Amino acid sequence: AVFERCELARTLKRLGMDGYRGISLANWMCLAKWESGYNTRATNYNAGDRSTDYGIFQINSRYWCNDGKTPGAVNACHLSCSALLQDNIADAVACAKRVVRDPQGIRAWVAWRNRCQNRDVRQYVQGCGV
C-alpha cells in the first residue's frame, strides 16, 4: 500500500509512534517519506553485502528481520521480512521501535541523517490532526 501523507500520520500516531523514545511524529514521517515514499511493499536489494531493505521504513535484513538469504544475518525484531511488506504497518512499527531502542536511536537510518536531521520537518504533519 502507498499511504497518503496525513492518513499515515494518524496511522502512526494510533500505533504509539508520537514521541516514542523522544522521536516526534514529524521525524517518523520524514523517514518513511525519504525511505520509501510511504510505500509498504518497497524493497531495495544491496548487491554489495547481499542484504535487502524492506517496507515503508526500508528495514535491513542483516540485523532486523529474517529472509533466509542474507549471510550471517540476525533477526532482532524476531519477524519474517515478509511481515514488513504487509499493507498493515503494525509489525513494521514494532520493528522500527525495536531499531530505535538501540544506541543510535533515529540515527540508525542514514537517510534520516541526510534528509531529516536539523531540517524543518513540520511540513510532514501539518493539517493532519495529530
Side-chain angles (χ1 to χ4, degrees):
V2 181
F3 283 81
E4 283 189 284
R5 185 176 64 89
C6 289
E7 187 55 53
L8 177 64
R10 291 183 294 265
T11 300
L12 291 176
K13 190 177 180 174
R14 288 187 282 267
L15 290 163
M17 292 290 254
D18 192 8
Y20 184 86
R21 289 284 287 183
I23 304 163
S24 73
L25 200 65
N27 277 291
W28 288 117
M29 287 295 289
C30 184
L31 179 64
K33 169 62 175 41
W34 290 102
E35 287 298 346
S36 65
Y38 310 141
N39 177 17
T40 63
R41 37 138 45 225
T43 49
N44 179 55
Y45 177 60
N46 301 297
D49 88 321
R50 307 195 148 148
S51 71
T52 304
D53 303 314
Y54 295 89
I56 198 168
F57 298 122
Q58 288 291 273
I59 288 169
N60 191 264
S61 59
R62 183 150 297 285
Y63 328 86
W64 312 102
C65 65
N66 181 46
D67 63 0
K69 60 172 165 53
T70 307
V74 288
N75 182 6
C77 291
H78 301 98
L79 285 174
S80 164
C81 294
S82 170
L84 302 186
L85 297 182
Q86 301 175 81
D87 277 9
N88 179 275
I89 63 172
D91 292 324
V93 160
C95 191
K97 286 171 175 183
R98 170 64 182 83
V99 174
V100 304
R101 286 188 212 112
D102 268 13
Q104 291 183 290
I106 192 63
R107 282 153 169 85
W109 289 273
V110 174
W112 180 87
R113 281 132 71 153
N114 302 339
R115 349 281 300 216
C116 309
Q117 177 168 201
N118 307 146
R119 306 270 203 156
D120 184 331
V121 294
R122 300 155 183 81
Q123 74 207 276
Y124 294 102
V125 293
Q126 304 310 291
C128 309
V130 294

